[PDB]
């Protein structure tokens, strides 16, 4: 039998109520005699396809519904089999979010939307408009506070502002999303992102702010407002902050338009435990008692289960969540969503940091949101392996040196690439073109690096005055991020962090 057989393994994001979910697990364990293990690995939405594609991975995966069409298309999700009596228990809107090609491919759990969260003591009357935020920040800075902090590293949190004046992901025409009609580079999207960039230029926000920083600042009473979802309320309750949850500010007189996500639970197509998974989800989790256990840990939002929602509906924070949801739009679940999110993430980060202008960043996003991408076989905790796009720079291993190449084509669902060494070759002055697989290339990340390699790490690094990557060892990393290296088989050599990659020889 498969190693996975005879138990349940469940993945859920670290910002959700995994401890509450484990309480539901324990009830199931008591009745069935079968073990349930809840895990919350980092980047689980990226890890899941890699492990599920080999027939491994968790039996049940939790994520917002947007990523599930891609998983389903890829053959990674089982069609679920709820009967009509069970289907009646959940709102039809929520079932719709988990349909792909007319089939139910997950169980819906709860409706999520971002709201404006504000400190009632610092700010009893929060601003109705984005335009009011600069003056409010000027006022608050005089007492060593700031107006607003929210996660600028995930485009989810900036999307409501991008969409407000007309930005959109994919246009919905004739019952379907048109992957050739992307709206991230129209006047509305430009206006919203420009407003964000201006907030940063004018020192009302910091481009480096992430989820943890914004949460800590709000919960410690340092900033008067944040933008977050229901899952965040528990930590605020525990803090000493008196908070309200309200409608997002308008931009150019129009509502902010947050994406609406339905937290959903899919069953791995390869799981030998599909019946156990169905029993857990239908008979334990999607009950008043099951959802209450998770919700008590971290709030779910507006739950899919009608009977339990009749209670939560009266919570003013839930009223605010649904007001914001109504003003927004349900995320698509099409397979192109992963490419869309990589593209918008990169545009927001690059524009916020000033590395690119708004126009430059959104033009690139428009192109790439609609593109096929691949990933290197080689994974590292220190360097990303995706997305490999047309126009990406990679190190390629000719059939221990690797050579710098540009990606010309990505084909066969990212399993085959056409890459070009742009240096003149005897067979063409424009450079030699190679065809390769995922094991033969490494992504050179195009953006500012995020993590140091620990001293002693074997790496591949571009040698000064060359376009060739050679094996080396990391001696250390400077404050500015520069790598100090000893190249194999040659003073130590300083190489920019961007040009230092994982070593497949070491990884293998």
């Amino acid at each position: 039998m498969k190693i996975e057989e005879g138990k349940l393994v469940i993945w859920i994001n670290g910002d959700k109520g995994y401890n509450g979910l484990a309480e539901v697990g324990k009830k199931f364990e008591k009745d069935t005699g079968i073990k349930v293990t809840v895990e919350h690995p980092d980047k689980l939405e990226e890890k899941f396809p890699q492990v599920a594609a080999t027939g491994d991975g968790p039996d049940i995966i939790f994520w917002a519904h947007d990523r599930f069409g891609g998983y389903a298309q890829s053959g990674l999700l089982a069609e679920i089999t709820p009967d009509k009596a069970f289907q009646d228990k959940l709102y039809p809107f929520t079932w719709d979010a988990v349909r792909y090609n007319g089939k139910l491919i997950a169980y819906p759990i709860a409706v999520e939307a971002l709201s404006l969260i504000y400190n009632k003591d610092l700010l009893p009357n929060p601003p109705k408009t984005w335009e009011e935020i600069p003056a409010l920040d000027k006022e608050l800075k005089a007492k060593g506070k700031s107006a607003l902090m929210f996660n600028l590293q995930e485009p989810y949190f900036t999307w409501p502002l991008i969409a407000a004046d007309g930005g959109y992901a994919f246009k919905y025409e004739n019952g379907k999303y048109d992957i050739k009609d992307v709206g991230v580079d129209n006047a509305g999207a430009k206006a919203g992102l420009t407003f964000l960039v201006d907030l940063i230029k004018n020192k009302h926000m910091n481009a480096d702010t992430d989820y943890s920083i914004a949460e800590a600042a709000f919960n410690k009473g340092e900033t008067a407002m944040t933008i977050n979802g229901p899952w965040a309320w528990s930590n605020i309750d525990t803090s000493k902050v008196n908070y309200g949850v309200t409608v997002l500010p308008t931009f150019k007189g129009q509502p902010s338009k947050p994406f609406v996500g339905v937290l959903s639970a899919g069953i791995n197509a390869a799981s030998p435990n599909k019946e156990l998974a169905k029993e857990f989800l239908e008979n334990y989790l999607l009950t008043d008692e099951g959802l209450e256990a998770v919700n008590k840990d971290k709030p779910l939002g507006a739950v899919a289960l009608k009977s339990y929602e009749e209670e939560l509906a009266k919570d003013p924070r839930i009223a605010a969540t649904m007001e914001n949801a109504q003003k927004g739009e349900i995320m698509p679940n099409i397979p192109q969503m992963s490419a869309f999110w990589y593209a918008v993430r990169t545009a927001v980060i690059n524009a916020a940091s000033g590395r690119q202008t708004v126009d430059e960043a959104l033009a690139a996003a428009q192109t790439n949101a609609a593109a096929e991408f691949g990933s290197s076989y080689w994974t590292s905790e220190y360097n990303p392996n995706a997305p490999i796009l047309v126009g990406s720079e990679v190190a390629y291993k000719p059939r221990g040196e690797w050579i710098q190449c540009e990606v010309l084509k990505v084909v066969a669902d990212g399993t085959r690439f056409e890459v070009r060494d742009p240096e003149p070759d005897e067979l063409g002055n424009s450079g030699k073109v190679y065809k390769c697989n995922r094991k033969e290339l490494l992504l050179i990340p195009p953006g500012f690096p995020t993590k140091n390699y620990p001293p002693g790490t074997k790496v591949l690094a571009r040698y000064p005055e060359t376009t060739t990557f050679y094996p080396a060892i990391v001696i250390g990393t400077k404050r500015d991020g520069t790598c100090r290296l000893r190249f194999d088989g040659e003073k130590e050599t300083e190489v920019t962090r961007r040009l230092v990659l994982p070593s497949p020889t070491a990884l293998a």
Binding site: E401, I403, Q404, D421, E423, Y463, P464, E465, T466, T467, T468, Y470
Partner: peptide
């Protein structure tokens, strides 16, 4: 490629 350019080499060392």
């Amino acid at each position: 490629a350019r080499t060392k």
